[PDB]
Structures are given as structure tokens and as C-alpha cells.
């Protein structure tokens, strides 16, 4: 409702608790280039350098 001489004031209240879930950090990962090509072989290292 909309009126100039009318006003609404709350006579009672309530305490509501909500939840927002915010991420902070992710999982730390490190990938090797040589072992991702192959290990225990010099062919991957000479051709990769």
C-alpha cells in the first residue's frame, strides 16, 4: 500500500542466521616436464632440452 499519511513500523522482530560458503585456497600441485614425457630414458631428455 502507498499513502502519504500512512506509515508502517515493526512491532516485533526475529534473529535469522544464514550461511555463505566462500572458498579460500585450492590444492597445491607441481607437474614435472621430464617425468611427464618419460622417466629413466635419455631420449626424452635430449629431445626435450
Amino acid at each position: 500500500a502507498y499513502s502519504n499519511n500512512s506509515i508502517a513500523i515493526p512491532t516485533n522482530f526475529t534473529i535469522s542466521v544464514t550461511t555463505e560458503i566462500l572458498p579460500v585456497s585450492m590444492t597445491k600441485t607441481s607437474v614435472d616436464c621430464t617425468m611427464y614425457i618419460c622417466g629413466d630414458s635419455t631420449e626424452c631428455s635430449n629431445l626435450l632440452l
Binding site: S30, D32, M35, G39, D40
Partner: protein, 49 residues
Amino acid sequence: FLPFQQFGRDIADTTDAVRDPQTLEILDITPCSFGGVSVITPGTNTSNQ
């Protein structure tokens, strides 16, 4: 392993298992141990530890 299965590979297409060509024995291929080498050292002008 089933009696007729010779070898197998992992999701990376590298061979993780093999059957004994002489006797009947079943062996998994586990790559040699590795990881990254992490160096905890102070500055070069501090010490060599």
C-alpha cells in the same frame, strides 16, 4: 589375472603388469621410487648448509 591375460597398462598407457614368460607367475610393474628434491637452504652469502 585371468589365465589368458599377458600384460596390462594403466590409464597413462604405461605397462603396470607382466606375466612370467618361463614359469607361471604374475608380476606388477612399479616404477622406481621418485619425487621432487626440495632444498632448504639460506642465501649463498649466508652459508652452504
